[PDB]
Design a protein around this ligand. Sequence first.
Ligand SMILES: COc1ccc(C2=NN(C3CCCCCC3)C(=O)C2(C)C)cc1OC1CCCC1
Ligand SMILES: [Mg+2]
Ligand SMILES: [Zn+2]
Length: 330
Amino acid sequence: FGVKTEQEDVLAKELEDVNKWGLHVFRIAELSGNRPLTVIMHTIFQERDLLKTFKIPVDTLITYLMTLEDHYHADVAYHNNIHAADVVQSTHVLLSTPALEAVFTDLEILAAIFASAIHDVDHPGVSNQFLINTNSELALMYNDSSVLENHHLAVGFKLLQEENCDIFQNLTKKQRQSLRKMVIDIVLATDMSKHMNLLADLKTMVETKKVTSSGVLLLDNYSDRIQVLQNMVHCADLSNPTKPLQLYRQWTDRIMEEFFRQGDRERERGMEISPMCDKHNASVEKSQVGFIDYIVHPLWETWADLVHPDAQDILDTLEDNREWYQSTIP
Ligand SMILES: COc1ccc(C2=NN(C3CCCCCC3)C(=O)C2(C)C)cc1OC1CCCC1
Ligand SMILES: [Mg+2]
Ligand SMILES: [Zn+2]
């Protein structure tokens, strides 16, 4: 023909939800033959007209996206291509918030989306502390400093050098240096060791926020523009408890599989078992409530303040999910 297969048609219909919080991302993964990152990135690039704006050849974009997706580990339950696709799509929705309308440049939008796509690539499904404590090659290469996040960046960039993978081949050197610095600043900010300082800075910005042209955020220096993008992708990375419960519970099952497997590797090696990694001493419900109360709600309450009232429904879903997990603490 020159028309979609029936499986491609069902995928195209699910992808009509790409602009919505609560996309059926697991169904997209199944329908695309485990290509959720490639199909969601391609959809977003076409929707935001990024191929025309950045003169990206479409065969190059698809080759890079398949290569990138292939470097996510299919044997890792959480930190895989489905999580990458979810953070991309969640960033895409946050960038579209009315409070940020016409704030960011096309290059900043490309930086936030590309950062989201690469931000966990080649994740081995164990923590930075695990890699440091095992004397792993990755921890030695990065001198024990944001080990995974340094690695995700290095892999995401190095894959541009594979055959027909250089999606930035038509950008000027000035565009490429600006894009590269923003992408590095965003992915390094996904290290949970940076969370308390990012949140402190987001609160300072909400406290002294200016809303110029009568409605929309004023961000007039790199420090403030990159802090908003860093917090936005960090919000997307920590968005699972803000999603409809059927999605949240799938993410909880996956992160607990990954954590319990790390705890099994710690226990078999006689290491201290990391927080929430002991399947024999586990309180999944209590852990989700503590995670929401100490990390996710303080972040999303502050984001919701920055973009008030755009994120009210997201904060309400988070609060409903928190009450649901509390109510099932045995
Ligand atoms: C759906 O539940 C979760 C989704 C993502 C996370 C994460 N947050 N973190 C931090 C790390 C610092 C030490 C403490 C862990 C939190 C991460 O490193 C990742 C990205 C894996 C956590 C999620 O929930 C887990 C299971 C129970 C509560 C934390
Ligand atoms: Mg990460
Ligand atoms: Zn992540």
